[PDB]
Amino acid sequence: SVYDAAAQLTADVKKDLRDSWKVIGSDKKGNGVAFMTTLFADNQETIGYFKRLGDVSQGMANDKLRGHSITLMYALQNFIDQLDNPDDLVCVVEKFAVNHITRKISAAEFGKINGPIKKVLASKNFGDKYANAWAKLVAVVQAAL
Amino acid sequence: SVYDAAAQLTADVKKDLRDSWKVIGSDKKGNGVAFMTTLFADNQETIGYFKRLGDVSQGMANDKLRGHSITLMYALQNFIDQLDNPDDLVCVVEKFAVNHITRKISAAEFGKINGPIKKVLASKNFGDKYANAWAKLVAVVQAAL
Numbered sequence: 001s002v003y004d005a006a007a008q009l010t011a012d013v014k015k016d017l018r019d020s021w022k023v024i025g026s027d028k029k030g031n032g033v034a035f036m037t038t039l040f041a042d043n044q045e046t047i048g049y050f051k052r053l054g055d056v057s058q059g060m061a062n063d064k065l066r067g068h069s070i071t072l073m074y075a076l077q078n079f080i081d082q083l084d085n086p087d088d089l090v091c092v093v094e095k096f097a098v099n100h101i102t103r104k105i106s107a108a109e110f111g112k113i114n115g116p117i118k119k120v121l122a123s124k125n126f127g128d129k130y131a132n133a134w135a136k137l138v139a140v141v142q143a144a145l
Numbered sequence: 146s147v148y149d150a151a152a153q154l155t156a157d158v159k160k161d162l163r164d165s166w167k168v169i170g171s172d173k174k175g176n177g178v179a180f181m182t183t184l185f186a187d188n189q190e191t192i193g194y195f196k197r198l199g200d201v202s203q204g205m206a207n208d209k210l211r212g213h214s215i216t217l218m219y220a221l222q223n224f225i226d227q228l229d230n231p232d233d234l235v236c237v238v239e240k241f242a243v244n245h246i247t248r249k250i251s252a253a254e255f256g257k258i259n260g261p262i263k264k265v266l267a268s269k270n271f272g273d274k275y276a277n278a279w280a281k282l283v284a285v286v287q288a289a290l
């Protein structure tokens with residue numbers, strides 16, 4: 001249940017998401033592409049889903065991948081801004097879920113993004129505490145898949 | 146080319162776009178929905194395109210329509226943030242273009258959003274000069290359709 005999942009976003013979890021997002025969200029292009037390339041490096045089996053992007057191994061040099069990556073960061077930006085209103089958070093999460101449901105992405109495969117996020121945050125000096133806070137936000141989307 | 150359409154946006158147009166977005170972009174849920182409802186009111190022929198959203202006459206109460214409207218405002222947020230780097234603006238513009246190209250939305254039909262934007266801007270006291278600025282940004286997307 002997406003509503004129960006959303007209820008998991010307590011005061012301290014929301015604070016950690018905001019604090020960390022201030023840093024990660026400052027460089028959407030850089031951190032967005034980092035999220036994606038790490039995903040393709042740690043989970044090669046997911047690469048097939050991104051056929052439209054072309055050769056994802058080109059990383060930042062791939063215009064389609066860059067455009068996709070930036071936009072992805074704005075989806076996360078959207079979530080952060082809706083944290084105060086669970087009713088609004090839920091409707092945007094369900095909107096993005098559809099984008100993935102139509103691409104045949106399960107909750108399990110969607111969860112594979114947790115690995116990249118934890119790594120990127122770690123390189124930014126943000127540990128498990130923050131990695132776990134983000135896992136909860138991700139869990140909200142997984143509940144709609 | 147889209148690059149030609151983008152690389153031509155001037156400092157004065159970027160200035161007006163940013164000043165107006167400061168206000169319009171501060172209430173993404175309200176202004177986003179206003180954009181959509183005004184479109185349906187003045188261009189009823191477009192309603193059929195949004196069947197996934199269900200009964201769009203429900204307005205704000207329609208969770209699907211609300212989720213779509215908020216997200217659309219972030220697409221614009223994206224555009225606004227990439228104004229000083231045509232290279233990034235182009236890759237994101239082309240990304241959103243595909244979303245519409247897939248729905249068979251022509252450059253002419255996409256331009257229908259100009260009316261709603263003009264009216265919403267006006268409700269906030271941003272005149273024709275500001276409406277023309279936005280028409281120029283919309284044209285960047287049109288160059289890609």
Ligand code: HEM
Nearest residue numbers: 046049050052071072075076099103105109110112113244
């Ligand atoms: C933090 C997690 C994630 C977020 C916020 C996110 C966000 C997005 C956004 C905004 C889009 C564009 C939607 C559209 O225009 O159709 C997208 C597309 C896509 N996503 Fe995700 N995504 C995430 C994780 C994943 C994961 C882990 C997978 C699969 C293992 C996945 C697979 C896809 C696919 C297949 C597309 C279509 C790409 C294309 O062909 O253009 N996403 N995602």
Ligand code: HEM
Nearest residue numbers: 099191194195197216217220221244248250254255257258
């Ligand atoms: C200010 C210009 C506009 C922006 C920024 C914009 C943005 C968006 C975004 C972000 C989506 C979601 C893409 C996805 O997840 O697949 C979308 C969907 C769509 N847009 Fe636009 N759009 C604009 C104008 C228009 C206009 C004028 C039309 C039609 C004349 C149009 C028709 C559609 C349709 C049919 C969809 C699919 C809706 C659905 O089934 O979920 N858009 N748009």
